[PDB]
Design a protein around this ligand. Sequence first.
Ligand SMILES: CC(C)n1c(CC[C@@H](O)C[C@@H](O)CC(=O)O)c(-c2ccc(F)cc2)c2c3ccccc3n(-c3ccccc3)c(=O)c21
Ligand SMILES: CC(C)n1c(CC[C@@H](O)C[C@@H](O)CC(=O)O)c(-c2ccc(F)cc2)c2c3ccccc3n(-c3ccccc3)c(=O)c21
Ligand SMILES: CC(C)n1c(CC[C@@H](O)C[C@@H](O)CC(=O)O)c(-c2ccc(F)cc2)c2c3ccccc3n(-c3ccccc3)c(=O)c21
Ligand SMILES: CC(C)n1c(CC[C@@H](O)C[C@@H](O)CC(=O)O)c(-c2ccc(F)cc2)c2c3ccccc3n(-c3ccccc3)c(=O)c21
Lengths: 414, 413, 421, 420
Amino acid sequence: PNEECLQILGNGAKFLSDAEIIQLVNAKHIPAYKLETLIETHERGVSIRRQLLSKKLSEPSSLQYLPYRDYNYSLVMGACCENVIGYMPIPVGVAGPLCLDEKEFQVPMATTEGCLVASTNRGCRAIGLGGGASSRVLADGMTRGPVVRLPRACDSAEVKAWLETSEGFAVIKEAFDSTSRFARLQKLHTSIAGRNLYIRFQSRSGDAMGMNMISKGTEKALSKLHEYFPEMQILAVSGNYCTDKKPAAINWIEGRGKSVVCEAVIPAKVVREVLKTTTEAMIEVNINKNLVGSAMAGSIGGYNAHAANIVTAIYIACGQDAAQNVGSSNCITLMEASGPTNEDLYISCTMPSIEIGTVGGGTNLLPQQACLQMLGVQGACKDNPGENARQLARIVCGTVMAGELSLMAALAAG
Amino acid sequence: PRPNEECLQGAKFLSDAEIIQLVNAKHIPAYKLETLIETHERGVSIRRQLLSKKLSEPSSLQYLPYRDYNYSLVMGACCENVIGYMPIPVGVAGPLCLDEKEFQVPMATTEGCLVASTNRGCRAIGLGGGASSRVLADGMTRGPVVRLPRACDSAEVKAWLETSEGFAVIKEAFDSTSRFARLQKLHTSIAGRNLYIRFQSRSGDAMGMNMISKGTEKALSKLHEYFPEMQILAVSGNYCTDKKPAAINWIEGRGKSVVCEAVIPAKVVREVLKTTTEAMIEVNINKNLVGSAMAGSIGGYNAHAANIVTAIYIACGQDAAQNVGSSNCITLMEASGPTNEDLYISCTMPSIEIGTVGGGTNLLPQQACLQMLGVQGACKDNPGENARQLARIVCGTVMAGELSLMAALAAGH
Amino acid sequence: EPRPNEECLQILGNAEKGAKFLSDAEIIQLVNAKHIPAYKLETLIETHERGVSIRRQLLSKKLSEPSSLQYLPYRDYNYSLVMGACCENVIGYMPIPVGVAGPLCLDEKEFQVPMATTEGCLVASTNRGCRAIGLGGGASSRVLADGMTRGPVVRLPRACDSAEVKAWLETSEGFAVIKEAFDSTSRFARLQKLHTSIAGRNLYIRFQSRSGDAMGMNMISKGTEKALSKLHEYFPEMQILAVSGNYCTDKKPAAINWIEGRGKSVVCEAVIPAKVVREVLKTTTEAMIEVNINKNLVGSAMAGSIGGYNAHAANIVTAIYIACGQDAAQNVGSSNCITLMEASGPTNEDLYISCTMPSIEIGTVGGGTNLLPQQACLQMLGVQGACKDNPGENARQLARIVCGTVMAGELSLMAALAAGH
Amino acid sequence: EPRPNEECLQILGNAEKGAKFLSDAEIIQLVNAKHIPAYKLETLIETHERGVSIRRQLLSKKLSEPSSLQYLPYRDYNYSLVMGACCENVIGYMPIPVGVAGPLCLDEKEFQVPMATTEGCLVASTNRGCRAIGLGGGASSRVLADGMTRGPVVRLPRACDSAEVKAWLETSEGFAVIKEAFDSTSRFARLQKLHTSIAGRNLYIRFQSRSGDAMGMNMISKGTEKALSKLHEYFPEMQILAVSGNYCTDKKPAAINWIEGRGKSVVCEAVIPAKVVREVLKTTTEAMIEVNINKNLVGSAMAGSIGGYNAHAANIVTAIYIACGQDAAQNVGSSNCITLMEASGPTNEDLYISCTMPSIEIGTVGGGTNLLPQQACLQMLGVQGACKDNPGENARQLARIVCGTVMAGELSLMAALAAG
Ligand SMILES: CC(C)n1c(CC[C@@H](O)C[C@@H](O)CC(=O)O)c(-c2ccc(F)cc2)c2c3ccccc3n(-c3ccccc3)c(=O)c21
Ligand SMILES: CC(C)n1c(CC[C@@H](O)C[C@@H](O)CC(=O)O)c(-c2ccc(F)cc2)c2c3ccccc3n(-c3ccccc3)c(=O)c21
Ligand SMILES: CC(C)n1c(CC[C@@H](O)C[C@@H](O)CC(=O)O)c(-c2ccc(F)cc2)c2c3ccccc3n(-c3ccccc3)c(=O)c21
Ligand SMILES: CC(C)n1c(CC[C@@H](O)C[C@@H](O)CC(=O)O)c(-c2ccc(F)cc2)c2c3ccccc3n(-c3ccccc3)c(=O)c21
């Protein structure tokens, strides 16, 4: 019906059928934007959106194998996704044990690339027979890099000098830190371009990746800066000086999120039996591929074989922002001869800009929390704020090193 | 639970608890179960149980799902050591009015506001007459490193590859490996006695990594016949460049190079995007050009192309790790129209690495999202037209995302 | 005794008298009253040198310290070849000390390399590198490419239109038409394959061509102008925004020069015996490779370098460029260099070295190479002027000498760093 | 007249006779017979000019064309300040034409800028830019930072050890000990915030400090030796692999100089009235902005440039550097510049321009600035030598003049490109 359908809606939506609510869209009665709140259950809302979508597609049977039933939409709606028509299953394999810092980890990897999980698993095996890997977090601080503008370059210079004094920095730090308990503003990084001023705010953010919290603190910091400099115009809360989800030398040099190093010595016996190559062959490929090769290609921060493969796979499994693989994959892989007879392989990976978290975003979803719980880093750390996210970053750097070892060995053997 | 003595006699008759009790007691090794178990879902079940005992929290796997998923197309193709699947929420933004067509773009993400933002950008484009796009180039690459005894020798190989006859014989060996293998002009760079050779070729509708790799191996084998002292050091010497940031991809292109554009009426910028044309151009210059410049960016002259690229890629069975290079984008904005109050926008993406056959596009859920766009599988009549169409949709959806986010930043919300 | 401005104007306005009759103070009177422009002083006055003397006196009164130009030399210099070609508003010349480093044993020949510098120990260091190369049986080098570029930016109404122009330039027929127009501007113009890049409705076109022994800036620009005019006949809606849209790229750092090359791309190499590494360079092969990997590769990588995978190629390039009449501002791109080092020989104790420099922008005709003093330095190397029998051979040879001298400088500085001196 | 070998040697040994008593042809005979090596021809000869003449004669016979040095000048140059300080194996000097562009109206002062070049139209073009700036009310500039750097590479046995050293350097007390050692080497030394980067067991340490009016290369390297020696005491397993590990970065392109700055970071600006853009520059403000955006921003972006967002800053930097006794090889990094242009004023017809140069490496004492001809060009600008009442003011002033002259050159060349 048409008129009777509106009456029952005013009382609920359960008494109206699927075909009746879809008829309210077609025959203009009530618009399409009112759909999330109106329907009772979340799963039925997804079903009605899929039927509406089906008639717009040139092949309505497209959605047949896109699944949607029995998924927990309660944590997704109004938090992680909009216009939800279902979910996308990504196969999850396991590579391990990764022997890292006197512990053993089973690393979940969501991917559809054949041989990737198997390769990473072989890398872990080589590391494990070689006495294990060790890693350190060198720095920690998510950033946001707004652009502001003053009437003149002489004015923007005045603002830069003011922020660089002990007093000016104290005023902006107090504003920034007041927005949340984990907001602790580190030293600012500023760059002038004429009358423009790019300001890089950096702060730890507990176990969150921290972009929402740092953005809150930045908005408050710029409002405080407005009081001391009324002619200043906030052009954008991000002027790409952060830098988020684009390649940027500033992330490579200053770091962003977690800066991490990892290392291991692979005994000569393990290089031959597990990796099917030699230490000499591995060093030759590493120098001429990951250093010289990347140099000839004009790379900034891409001094590695396939760090992005491991970063992406762990990120999708563990509820991270996979778009941040742009900067998070930044990595330099070094190799040299080691031990008394110089036949053992010393490997290290350095990743200055791993953008990561174990609370918020996709880490609030239960399947993603399962993969985080495998690693023992799910949620916030009560006793040591930021320790779970720090640990996950160490696991990412260590797993990348396992991937580097294995693929470089395949390339070396020919 | 029976003893392990009468368990030695195949798999279907035994129980799950029996197989795991033979792995720990060490009757059977740990690499026999992949082949012996018949039903693929039961293979994943046993793997999860063995995995559970290695974890400090064995119950961590409970909410990682695995039942009733189609593992037939995954095993021996897409993933190893499989313990389940990870559901990523899929939203839809559209219609995207692109080249006199309308697209409903699937986006797999867990970032709030992303799909709604892109949807708003699509609406502004549609009310402004739509967008137009063009594929400027097409060719996946692979960039091996070879070594000769001396720099004079590597120089000889470079000059030889640059003659018409030397290139012709290398092109012959390359193209023999596949129906779609058609080698384009080579790009070579010397570093002492090293020579980096950038093989480029179309690959039908595939992303083309496996095909170009096979062509490269046969091409280098032919080059070995003419230069027997040459050593193939690595089939990839990072000169491709695959899954790392590289200026060579930005300048020369990799996969599909694409451009897209649209004019948004001044009224549409005000009412839909809640800003002005003047404010949009101001932010684009000082964020996407000057800001990226101050940050030392190569190819990152955009707001958040990577967000859209990643969401479409995960939804459509692409290699998400290739978002590193595929997200390369320069967003440009200027005034347009008679009164100079309309907003011309353009996005240029020189290295979209993409495909509609092979890899994750073999799986049915991923094929469902590809089918929404009308690009699933190989185009029989025009090989590569589906992959090219998907690249255009990516670039157009990126432009929609740029429009919407830049408007949010420009109005200072 | 000085005279009125009007009386001096009637004498210089006359043909048979000239500035010879007038004094210094009287000519200064005419310039200050704007009857005679300052920049034309050479033309009006009887000699070039007196024109420079008058300009100096004009300038000295403007300065807070009138005796500032005392030790800036100017007398007895050949200003005839500078005027209307190399410099304007000339107030003298700047002496840069010139040292010699050699012999450099390169491609079975020997070179005495001139180096203009004020940096202590640079010439001596480079000289030590030459000595090490000479005792190791010399260096070999190859020119891998040759072609100066210009990278204009044009614009179409739409990106769909700029795309059409790109596709048209990539057809065999379209490239042929543009090639005919480019090559019609000079006998040395041979247009190579076009490299194009779109940015929306913008189109950046990279024209590349040999240029005889000239660096080729002017010749490539003239060919580019004619080529774009021909392109406009097929596409009347195209606007030539700028003849250089920074896509060349000239005198700015750019990955496109590193990857595609610009001017001459060159590679050079040598093997230094272990004995020579110990006795001349005061280090070992193992220590040299260790420093090269971690400084010139890893170190440059950590600093975010594109093209700067070397110790100090720019010191050598700059010193040779100033001495040999080159454009010293082009050291920005010409200094692009990757230095590689590894073990060699039967006991893995000898030191293989190589330098690869893809973008040496250089010439032996035109610009500063027209001046006699810098022609003297070119004549040392046997590369002065145009090679008639093999056009471009002299400029090619100079690029090889630059690359080989850089390698000598890399050897010597890296040895000093490896020893911890 | 040319005496036998042994008769010439006995006079040389006697220190109250020397090589003055002998002739030119006799000294050449002593070099070829291998009695006295060629490198030791500086000290033995009496006057510096004669020593250069003898080196030139020995060189001439080695060359395929013995008359090649004919037009390379050498006579009557003051070699006293050059020998053992600025150049070795000296065979003469190379005259670079010097032109003047000005007045440059900068910070309420007027400057006559010397420019050593052989590129036609460069000085005249720069001069036209200065004239446009002057008729527009002048330019204003600011020094935003000042600190020469050196970036050694050290190595610990493990990455965990290199991590420990990084953390130690980041504490207040660790940095204080290193700053005390660094600052002790010179009265102008003041070590700023230390900036480090790990690569496995490598640690790259970027030392930064002001250096008075010197470019500071020698000063910073000496302070860095002392700093690393002090760090050796707390970490004896550390190995100084190289005093420069290319992390400075000196004389190579590097994003670190672009982002962190090196030497003087400077900004300059001016507004050119619409009337002056039309008449002097022969173009419009609209055409200028359009060329600047699509050439200096979009164009440099398409070429994959880091720090090269300008038309020809390198031309001006190089011309001033050679004229003023600077290290011209440092033009690689000193040329780093971004040029921005906007519409300005009430009709939106005036042209606002700015140039930002984060890494001008420069000095007014030491190096080639010790030579008299180079000191004359520095004297033109009022920046010769060390400022006693404010150490670093002369070098800061020259940096501002460079940035201002670059902006003048940017204005003029961009106008010629815009006009077609
Ligand atoms: C990590 C894994 C997915 N993988 C990869 C990565 C491809 C991409 O994800 C990134 C890669 O392009 C990054 C790069 O190296 O530039 C290649 C690979 C690299 C460069 C090529 F040119 C072509 C293939 C290979 C590979 C190549 C030849 C022989 C064996 C190989 N095995 C393998 C198979 C079975 C047992 C043992 C080893 C791999 O697992 C493998
Ligand atoms: C695309 C979307 C996920 N989004 C984003 C992207 C954040 C990231 O994924 C990439 C971004 O960091 C890339 C960059 O700009 O550097 C920001 C954003 C950008 C820069 C910031 F500093 C902080 C937030 C914002 C945003 C910011 C302020 C006000 C509204 C906003 N809305 C919004 C909400 C409701 C209705 C209308 C608009 C967004 O949808 C949105
Ligand atoms: C080239 C020459 C002008 N030089 C230089 C300056 C290089 C610079 O122009 C570029 C350099 O900064 C590039 C780089 O390495 O980053 C240094 C030098 C380098 C880095 C430092 F930190 C401090 C000083 C050195 C040097 C240093 C220690 C011991 C010996 C040295 N010798 C030397 C002395 C006698 C016989 C043999 C060689 C030099 O000739 C020399
Ligand atoms: C600075 C000066 C030495 N100059 C230059 C330098 C080229 C180089 O030093 C840097 C340049 O390549 C950097 C770049 O723009 O990419 C060009 C120039 C630019 C791009 C070209 F394609 C070809 C020539 C021009 C120029 C070009 C066309 C018309 C007038 C010109 N005038 C001029 C003449 C008389 C009165 C007013 C101005 C110049 O002074 C001038």
